[PDB]
């Protein structure tokens, strides 16, 4: 969400008195959005709670030996018919499961 | 006022010609979304500025 979303109003709360619930309200004028509740996550309009930032940690590094372990496990279990069929492949007519073809 | 300038009179002249309704052929077009002129000013309700 953009950094400016919900904060482009100028909006002071009305304070105590006045029998309203002490939220910042939109300043003056003859429009619908005036005195109407402006900042804060629960208002119509307004920011949401903890705007998502682009400096969230999106990326994960795995150790090279862990990555290579996972490649070796993924290759070692692609040579077993039970595990390849449990992944879901239709393989009952395949001649031999480490299925190697000519280089043509 | 009965005493005007040419600038204010030309300003009022434009707002008097913008104040008409929509023509009734404009809503027979293909992609109409306009039902009425929603910028109609009445001289008692909205006081035009100045």
């Amino acid at each position: 969400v953009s950094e400016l979303a919900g904060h482009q109003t100028s909006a002071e709360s009305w304070g105590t008195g006045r029998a309203v619930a002490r939220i910042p309200r939109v300043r003056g004028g003859g429009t619908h959005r005036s005195g109407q509740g402006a900042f804060g996550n629960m208002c119509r309009g307004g920011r949401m709670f903890a705007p998502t930032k682009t400096w969230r940690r999106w990326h994960r590094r795995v150790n090279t030996t862990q990555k290579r372990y996972a490649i070796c496990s993924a290759l070692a279990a692609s040579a077993l018919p039970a595990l390849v069929m449990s992944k879901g492949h239709r393989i009952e007519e395949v001649p031999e499961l480490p299925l190697v073809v000519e280089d043509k | 006022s009965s005493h005007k300038t040419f600038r204010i009179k030309r300003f009022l002249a434009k707002k008097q010609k913008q104040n008409r309704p929509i023509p009734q052929w404009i809503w027979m077009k293909t992609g109409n979304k306009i039902r009425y002129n929603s910028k109609r000013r009445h001289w008692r309700r909205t006081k035009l500025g100045l």
Binding site: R18, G28, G29, G30, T31, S34, G35 | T46
Partner: peptide
């Protein structure tokens, strides 16, 4: 139409008002 702006409070309670005043 011009949406009426929120009710224009012009105080009466407080120390000026001589109607409803408490003890003190």
């Amino acid at each position: 139409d011009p949406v009426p702006y929120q009710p224009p409070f012009l105080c009466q309670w407080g120390r000026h008002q001589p109607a409803w005043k408490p003890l003190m």
